[PDB]
């Protein structure tokens, strides 16, 4: 709805920053609404979804096991590792690392997973292999959040991220069982509450993943819909703002409210 683009516009106003926005039909994949859809934005933590899709892909092909245990040391910890911090001693399984990266935004788990698959370049080739020639990962956590202006490293475009997400969750690239595991981790969010979830009506589905970076970078990807099932994909990125975290959350929440209200 154009009333939503009015809201997106206002948010750029308020934040004094670029907002990238897209709304995509899950079923048809058609573009419903857009705003800067082919501009680049840093992914920040929203890459972790893609990352665990690649892992799941390996597990579907027999080259990885969800139950495999990964051991690491205090040397591996990066800033913000709620879950990995706690299990230095005994290690964690692949399942538990994907759960922590996605449900708790644990930075070390992402790094450990990135290692297991061959690094940023391997993720990028995975993405390329499925038709996403725009999205690219170049660094590890936490340097991939630097958000240097005009830098193409670790960026995507709203359109590219959206259609890639669609494929992860509806195409034949992943087994049914793997796909649902993904949605399950995303549906279990503990950090994205003051974003889209705070405007979502009762009974609606949402599976999401948010990101934060330097230089006022904030972002979120999600699949949402009424009556308990996803109907569309929404992607919102922003960067270059001097606004506080809470004012950045509010505007994204307001974009959410207007999209739901004009559903």
From Swiss-Prot:
Catalysed reactions listed for this entry: a beta-lactam + H2O = a substituted beta-amino acid
Disulphide-bridged cysteine pairs: 52-98
Enzyme nomenclature, EC number: 3.5.2.6
Biotech use: This protein is used as a marker in many commonly used cloning vectors, such as pBR322 and the pUC series.
Residues that coordinate or bind substrate: 209-211
Annotated catalytic residues: 45, 143
The keyword Cell inner membrane is annotated on this UniProt entry: no
GO biological process: beta-lactam antibiotic catabolic process; response to antibiotic
Result of altering residue 139 to S: In TEM-5, TEM-8 and TEM-24
Matches recorded under InterPro entries: Beta-lactam/transpept-like (IPR012338), Beta-lactam_cat (IPR045155), Beta-lactam_class-A (IPR000871), Beta-lactam_class-A_AS (IPR023650)
Class of this enzyme: hydrolase
Keywords, sorted A to Z: Antibiotic resistance, Disulfide bond, Hydrolase, Plasmid, Signal, Transposable element
Effect of residue 79 to K: In TEM-3, TEM-4, TEM-6, TEM-8, TEM-16 and TEM-24
Result after altering residue 213 to S: In TEM-3, TEM-4 and TEM-8
Pfam family, one: Beta-lactamase2
GO molecular function, one term: beta-lactamase activity
Remarks, miscellaneous: The beta-lactamase present on pBR322 was cloned from plasmid R1 (R7268).
Family: Belongs to the class-A beta-lactamase family.
Function (record text): TEM-type are the most prevalent beta-lactamases in enterobacteria; they hydrolyze the beta-lactam bond in susceptible beta-lactam antibiotics, thus conferring resistance to penicillins and cephalosporins. TEM-3 and TEM-4 are capable of hydrolyzing cefotaxime and ceftazidime. TEM-5 is capable of hydrolyzing ceftazidime. TEM-6 is capable of hydrolyzing ceftazidime and aztreonam. TEM-8/CAZ-2, TEM-16/CAZ-7 and TEM-24/CAZ-6 are markedly active against ceftazidime. IRT-4 shows resistance to beta-lactamase inhibitors.
Protein's recorded name: Beta-lactamase TEM
Source organism of this protein record: Escherichia coli
Upper taxonomic lineage: Bacteria, Pseudomonadati, Pseudomonadota, Gammaproteobacteria, Enterobacterales
